[model samples]
Target: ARVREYSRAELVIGTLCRVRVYSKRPAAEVHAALEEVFTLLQQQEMVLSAYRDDSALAALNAQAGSAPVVVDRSLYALLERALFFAEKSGGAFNPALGAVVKLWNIGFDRAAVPDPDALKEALTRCDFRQVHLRAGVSVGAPHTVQLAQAGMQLDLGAIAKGFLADKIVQLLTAHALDSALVDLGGNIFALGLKYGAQRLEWNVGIRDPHGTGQKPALVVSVRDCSVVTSGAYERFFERDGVRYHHIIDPVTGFPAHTDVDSVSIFAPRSTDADALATACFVLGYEKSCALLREFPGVDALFIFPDKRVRASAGIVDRVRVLDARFVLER
Candidate 1:
């Protein structure tokens, strides 16, 4: 067959990144294009990574409370979006919670409850409003970012994968590929029609929050869109039978105690879906619905701890819940 699928999976950006493309082009050509994609992924990781001490973001964070630090064009653009969501969600999804994030360090070896006074100090540095951005004066001129206080970090863990997924989609589009699947960790972007015998559209599954195995609780058919899920089960630690998740509330300086077990969002841009899923999970159903109203063509699915699932009106009918224990509500 002229149309064949080519794929590659690797460990990059501290997670499994996989890209698959269906094309009629020669196998070698497809492989070469994929190499370019992975290379860009690695290069961008260097630009956006907060974990890397030599990353541009690290350099910016190191100079916090000093003069505005010039940043890469891509970093500037992402920071703009990060601040947009921070204001939109009223700090529910904040990127400037770096100090707070590191204080708790929920996903790392030092994971533990923070000291009360230390948490208070970290909370003071978690204000996204204190971060400033300035555009370049001319074409290819450098943009600058400034943190109003020291010890404030810019952690992009919540949104970086989605941003990377979108970048992969753009690269694929430039290669003239109509069909592809881009998965950065768990953030997924289905580029185009499946064009296979079983189905024409891509089938994306949402993980069952309660299941011990990698089973999908529900599935949705999508094309030319991104699907992202943020859940407590994704990253957490149980202490004294109490679970603490990585999605911290900037205001309280603690893991969000919302009723939502998980939230999945579908949008044309993976970057939006990534941050929105976290915001929606923290905001719960009603507030999340209100937030979705602000962004057109975006839909959400909320899974509760009580085995009840609620979906936005736009894509409620498109969702198919596979588990018998869960009830779906529109």
Candidate 2:
């Protein structure tokens, strides 16, 4: 049997990061697994949070008001994937939301509602189409990216956590610790089935969006997949009984207004689930249903404003409403 280490969790990337490793190896191996997580998150030149000074994206964003920036292969691959998704999601999950996000600054002390006219001006800076990417012509070639208009900002907040979780899984499995999971800022990555506990599927709880309770309103079974939830309840400022959340809709330059209280997406890759969660949440139940259909391997569960749980056809059989106040919709 393997032993656990101190904390078992840590604060990195400005968010809570938790890891689990199951192996017959000594406790040292377990410690190394956690260290790998830190190494990735603490990288000033690699992590996205380091955009202020040192990071792959930082080099690109510094020239936002000027010419195109050239980036290495790793950064290029990430941007390429994000660009493909931007068009696929129809900018519903745009990466160029940093300018507007800084305006409201939700989850921070300076968070507040912005003026409509100022917000409109910010929205104009959010067009993902103006951003361009030029791939390397040869193997191991660097990439070049450009933001056509000055003052445009790109924030990969919606998808970076998922991508990080996916990388963590790679670390865990490479060390033969195949049975494990990582919860990075609520973007959960399930590596393998629970071996000693009870079942083949990992059971993850869904938070109750309407209450202050820590209890999950529902639970879903997953295996070798990623589950990410984007909810207004996670971060918001309420004024005059009106809530403004951090998930901004690029088209409106404001918090995405939808019937959805939260959206949880499950996919083979964490990055996809991460971005799609925000996109699905903004798309609402009906439009999200159709959008999800385009991707066959993906499934989603949307909690409505009234606590009703609506799940995709793929997840209808695997989800169970744990709280009586939360009902599963047909």
Candidate 3:
């Protein structure tokens, strides 16, 4: 028996990242296996990354409004899943809101408030219904796929991380690895086991949405599932004490007017957790909780602006809220 660790450096999924793997095998064997895993992940990234100008996604974007672009299998699969969730959530979690996302410019360095008239124009091209998915391809009217507003662009920031985590977990499990934790940025997926625990529960910190990057607002126990959080505090611009954040409502071309400061969802599928977090955020507290009941094995936690916390019936039984400093009540 042996223990070894190997790290491979690469630019993947539009981010400079490293994949480090630890195994209880000979150093040479571990390195070889890890090298193969890393290579596959790199290829996955190349196929999925929307930021890469030459990626299949980019090619599709370039050909938008002109012809139905035949996409890669991975890209097609992801879009299909996104569309499903988008429909299930009633367009609140739309991927077709790419144009409006660009106009908000909340998270990027080049972020600027778009003119009202420009934003209105962008909304014309922001409907998810305009995107026709048929035979594993996307088609749109000529020039209609264009971001109607000058500054409008597509930002897949919400769902991409969770998609990556899901892909990584599937890859790890395919190798017969029963225990693993895959974290792509903040999105996390816990597989079969935890490193040192007989029980499978994994401790995850609920980040302080408004506070600095210090301690967690709370610690949550998760097992064999994914947890995703969307917060106004995650990516925002503060001007004169008001915050403008990345999550936007397509109807008004503005940030959602929700009582929630953050919403966290737990689900078996990372993509569901990711999309649900966004949908719940837009739907606000009551409507969100109502919508969640329609899905089995799905639960949510809503943190309002006033620090009051509410959990769905499914979550209340298992969740434990920490941090006495915040006035959280069940």
Candidate 4:
């Protein structure tokens, strides 16, 4: 079994990026193929990255309040998906919470709590309803979508990584590569089988949601599927013993008050897994279970703040809890 690896420092769209590709091919051929994938990734990032001040998305945000912004095909596709999930989850999985995200500065280098008055004003622009999308374009209220308001930004942090992974898998499959695993940040997409495996499945660990990184909460066997997790413990700041993280509630422009400490969703598509994880995290145990029951080929595991673990109907059968601290509820 031959293995080829290629890594490069990519600087084109917004943030400086590091991209790596692993393949079971001759080094030269694999490196060439990786260059192609890297180009695609850079192109996608240029069009979709919100971090780039001059990217199309940033330009759209700049003109959002004044006129409709026409989006490219990629942008349009993602927006359509975003809107679909927004409605599906009753706005719990909203892309319109970009403003509220900037307020907390949770993942930024300068993480700080915004002023109450500022947050309140930003909340006025936080409604997902304010964004209108049609035919690959978007428009919003005049004088209402200001980046200064903190609500005018669109936070795609939750879904972008997973979507990128999905894109990589698609590209790889097009090239006749049946076995591959794409891990973007923490989101993972596993396809086909690993080497020397009679079973075509990969074991994925569910990160503990209580900030302890020693052991996984559960492990699931997966193939040709995606697993995504969102938790209150992932990226947060503490002030006066209170932890503030990303994953804001679009309604109140604050961190969502939910009983779930973490939620993981498995689906056939990375986009679905990504969005569903966020939605389930916000919806928590019962609501998440109810919603999961409605979707086919999708399942979820929820870890409550009280250390109670719950899984959707079929999820428990597919997963094994490893941590003694967690109590699994079938």
Please tell me which predicted candidate would have the highest TM-score against the true structure. 1
Which ranges in model 4 have alpha carbons more than 4 Å from their true place?
A: 1-27, 106-111, 136-151, 211-215
- State how far residue 274 of model 4 sits from its true place (Å): 1.0
Candidate 1 on 1-330: residue-level lDDT in tens? 577888899999988899988898878878877998999988988888877888888899999899998887778888899899999998889999899888777444664678889889888888788899988678777788999877789999889998999888988888778799898888999999886754477888888876773778888888898999999888888767778888987768888888888999999999999999989888877888889899988988888999899888877888898887888986
Q: Which candidate, 1 or 2, has the higher TM-score?
A: 1
lDDT of 2 by residue, 159-235 (tens): 88887888788877887776677888778987777764444777888889876747888889888989999987788
Q: Model 3 over residues 268-309: C-alpha lDDT tens digits?
A: 988889988999999888878778878879878777777777
If both were scored by TM-score, which would come out higher, candidate 2 or candidate 4?
2
Candidates ranked by lDDT: 1, 2, 4, 3
lDDT of 3 at 14: 53
Instruction: Judge candidate 3 at residue 19 and give its lDDT.
Output: 42
**Model 3 misplaced stretches (Cα beyond 4 Å):** 1-41, 106-111, 136-154
Q: Would you list the clashing residue pairs of candidate 3?
A: none
Q: Per-residue error at 266 for model 4, in Å?
A: 0.4
What is the Cα-based TM-score of model 2? 0.92
What's the TM for model 3? 0.84
lDDT of each: 0.86, 0.79, 0.69, 0.72
Q: Sort by TM-score, best first.
A: 1, 2, 4, 3
Cα RMSDs, all models = 1.6, 2.4, 4.6, 4.9
- Once fitted onto the true fold, the runs of candidate 1 whose alpha carbons sit more than 4 angstroms away are 106-108, 197-199
The CA root-mean-square deviation of candidate 1, after full C-alpha superposition on the true structure, stands at: 1.6
RMSD of 4: 4.9
Clashes of each: 0, 0, 0, 2
Q: Which 10 successive residues of model 3 have the least lDDT summed? A: 141-150
Compute the lDDT of residue 172 as modeled in candidate 1: 84
